[PDB]
């Protein structure tokens, strides 16, 4: 009952929103894998007349590459209560977003016979805080 | 009419009721009809290809062979006999 | 211009403002009169002005009949008196005038009119029992300024 | 079985209505036909309702009308009991009249003209501008009402 209901780290998205590149080298040193460029839609008046152009970079970390990052990323910032999603995810800062979920998330991410996760099996903000508090740091 | 194009005055007949919107079921698009069979002519708004002239919507013709995958259906427009090239997607069997 | 040119329902419904431009504003200043904070169910007496013939009543006639009706109620019951009158019809029908002979005859936009069917309530006033004969007089003045003959019908009131 | 009689002429009458009367074997004013009560025939009299007078006749009245106005398919010949005896599947006018009313046969099926060419109404009819319910002579009649008309048109 409790084993298939206890949270796990799905992905740690480390992103850098610049606007105009040179920030790719420092991400690959702190994370462990390769980063990808980020484009943008709609013409903006802040000298952004090009649609398909490198504005930022992101890194999606999974499994061991995620936990070995969070052991050195979480003690760098003070986690608040209002910093949580309605789904139970948190973002701080270099933007570091952590997507937390229950063991049956493949059902909404697979190709064949996919279904959206029920509101009861969806993670709560309170149930998310309890998991991180139980792993080397304080809440509030 | 203000213009004499094929799709003139066809707002009603070539539009779907909101619930019949989206891609149509494949079953009726692959239906096989035999020569001599009486078929009803009605354009499916969701299917672009294999259509006939909208003036012929509502006709009940007779299948008299086929041209490729499309059918050659004989109708009588007023008093004039015409042969219509039409795919199964726009045809329904009588009864 | 006389009402003889616009009183009948002889043209199609011409209301679509997305295809019609230059429509004159409505001369109707108010639609909710008296005490618009109080409810219609808070009054014992409900008297309506019923139109007998199917007609088109212009915004100028609506304002004239409403003004001559409400002005009597302001005179007899006071400016902040215990009554509430409603003009339920709005001038939706846009009117033209051909003002060149019969060539390019589609007229320019000159006004608006309210299509009221026979048997319908144009005005409806809610008052007390002692103010009932003052409102029947306000409607007597109001029917003289519109095109058809009218009925002053009491809907809620067996106090006679 | 109803008895149709044309009371209004062909001029200004709709072509599809005039054609229905011709399909019901009635081509002139005052001409009568004996029509069965089926779904198909009901649609036809309803279309002709305003130019006709119909209703179920009594055995007595039908017998009087057949005696005086029935004609063979071809010829002048009187349709009396002896004629009915020699050419029909019946014994007398009564046997024919009963079969017609019970919808067992038709006048044509028995070698008689489908049309009973009646005489104008003696003492006149109730009028060709109003129906029976309004005091006129058009539309559906009572059995007593159609009898008065057919007997007046002997």
């Amino acid at each position: 009952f409790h084993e298939m209901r206890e949270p796990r780290i799905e992905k740690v998205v480390v992103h850098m929103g610049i606007g105009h590149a040179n920030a790719e080298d420092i991400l690959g040193e702190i994370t462990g894998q390769m980063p990808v460029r980020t484009k943008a839609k709609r013409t903006v008046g802040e000298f952004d007349i090009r649609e398909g152009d490198p504005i930022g970079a992101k890194v999606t970390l999974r499994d061991e590459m995620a936990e070995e990052f969070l052991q050195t990323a979480l003690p760098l910032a003070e986690l608040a209560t209002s910093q949580f999603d309605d789904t139970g995810n948190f973002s701080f800062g270099l933007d570091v977003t952590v997507n937390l979920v229950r063991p049956g998330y493949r059902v909404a991410k697979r190709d064949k016979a996919s279904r959206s996760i029920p509101t009861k099996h969806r993670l709560n903000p309170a149930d998310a805080v309890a998991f991180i508090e139980s792993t080397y740091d304080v809440e509030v | 009419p203000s213009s004499n194009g094929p799709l003139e005055g066809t707002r009603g007949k070539l539009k779907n009721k909101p619930r019949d919107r989206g891609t149509s079921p494949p079953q009726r698009a692959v239906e096989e009809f035999d020569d001599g069979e009486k078929v009803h002519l009605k354009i499916d708004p969701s299917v672009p290809n294999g259509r006939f002239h909208p003036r012929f919507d509502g006709q009940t013709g007779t299948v008299e062979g086929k041209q490729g995958d499309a059918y050659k259906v004989d109708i009588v427009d007023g008093g004039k006999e015409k042969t219509i090239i039409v795919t199964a997607a726009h045809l329904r069997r009588q009864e | 211009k006389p009402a003889s040119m616009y009183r009948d329902i002889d043209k199609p419904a011409y209301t679509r403002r997305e295809y019609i431009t230059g429509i004159p504003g409505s001369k109707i200043a108010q639609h909710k009169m008296g005490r618009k904070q109080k409810d219609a169910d808070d009054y014992p007496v409900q008297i309506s002005l019923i139109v007998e013939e199917t007609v088109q009543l212009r915004h100028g006639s609506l304002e004239a009949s409403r003004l001559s009706a409400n002005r009597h109620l302001i005179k007899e019951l006071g400016e902040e008196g215990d009554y509430k009158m409603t003009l339920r019809k709005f001038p939706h029908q846009v009117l033209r005038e051909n003002k060149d002979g019969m060539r390019a005859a589609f007229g320019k936009i000159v006004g608006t009119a309210a299509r009221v069917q026979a048997g319908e309530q144009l005005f409806t006033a809610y008052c007390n029992v002692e103010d009932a004969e003052h409102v029947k007089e306000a409607f007597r003045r109001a029917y003289n300024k519109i095109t058809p003959s009218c009925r002053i019908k009491v809907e809620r009131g067996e106090e006679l | 079985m109803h008895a149709l009689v044309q009371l209004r002429g062909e001029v200004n009458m709709h072509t599809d209505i005039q054609d229905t009367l011709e399909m019901l074997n009635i081509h002139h004013v005052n001409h009568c036909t004996l029509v069965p009560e089926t779904d198909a025939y009901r649609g036809m009299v309803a279309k002709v309702n305003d130019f006709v007078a119909f209703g179920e006749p009594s055995q007595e009245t039908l017998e009087t009308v057949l005696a005086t106005r029935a004609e063979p398919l071809e010829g002048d010949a009187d349709v009396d009991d002896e004629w009915v005896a020699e050419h029909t599947d019946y014994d007398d006018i009564s046997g024919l009249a009963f079969a017609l009313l019970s919808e067992e046969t038709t006048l044509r099926e028995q070698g008689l003209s489908p049309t009973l060419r009646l005489h104008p109404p003696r003492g006149g009819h109730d009028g060709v501008k109003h129906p029976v319910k309004e005091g006129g002579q058009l539309g559906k009649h009572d059995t007593e009402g159609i009898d008065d008309l057919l007997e007046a048109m002997r």
Partner: protein
């Protein structure tokens, strides 16, 4: 759902089970469909034709009924997939089915995958199915040589239940031999 104008998808689209656009292009051939479906533990292969009230299956084969002929090995792999296709294809030849078109459903057209193995098996059984040779796996991977060379990196055994130690892809050969023989009870 929200109101009268709301358009609820077709049932098999709502369930995310049928790609209706691919289905039409598949049905355009006029030939029966070789429905190649997978599961985590098993592999299915059906020969489906078109019917008035729904689809008609003329000859099927699941990897569970493979054991009926002598398969003591697992059922969700490459050798299993080929043999399930071969079994479906042979049952099809007895039903009168001579030609088919490969339906992979919502599975990916990845080179050398299990659904292409199901196809290679059905063709080898005598069915005429439009294929591409270089999209199919090399004969040794179909045998299960990739699983044997994975058991060479032993230390800890690959299979939990006792079948063998170093794995026998020779069982594939001993199964294709049994099915190619006409004396078999289908």
């Amino acid at each position: 759902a929200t109101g009268p104008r709301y358009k609820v998808p077709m049932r098999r689209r709502r369930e995310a089970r049928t790609d209706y656009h691919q289905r039409l292009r598949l049905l355009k051939s006029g030939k029966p469909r070789l429905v190649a479906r997978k599961s985590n533990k098993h592999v299915r292969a059906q020969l489906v034709t078109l019917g008035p009230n729904g689809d008609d299956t003329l000859a099927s084969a699941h990897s569970s009924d493979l054991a009926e002929y002598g398969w003591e090995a697992p059922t969700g792999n490459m050798p299993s997939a080929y043999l399930t296709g071969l079994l479906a294809g042979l049952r099809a030849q007895e039903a009168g089915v001579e030609e088919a078109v490969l339906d992979i459903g919502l599975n990916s057209p990845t080179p050398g995958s299990k659904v292409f193995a199901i196809q290679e098996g059905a063709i080898d059984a005598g069915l005429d199915i439009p294929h591409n040779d270089d999209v199919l796996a090399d004969w040794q991977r179909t045998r299960g040589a990739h699983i044997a060379e994975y058991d060479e990196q032993l230390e800890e055994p690959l299979y939990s239940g006792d079948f063998d130690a170093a794995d026998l892809p020779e069982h594939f050969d001993e199964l294709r031999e049994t099915l190619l023989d006409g004396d078999i009870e289908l």
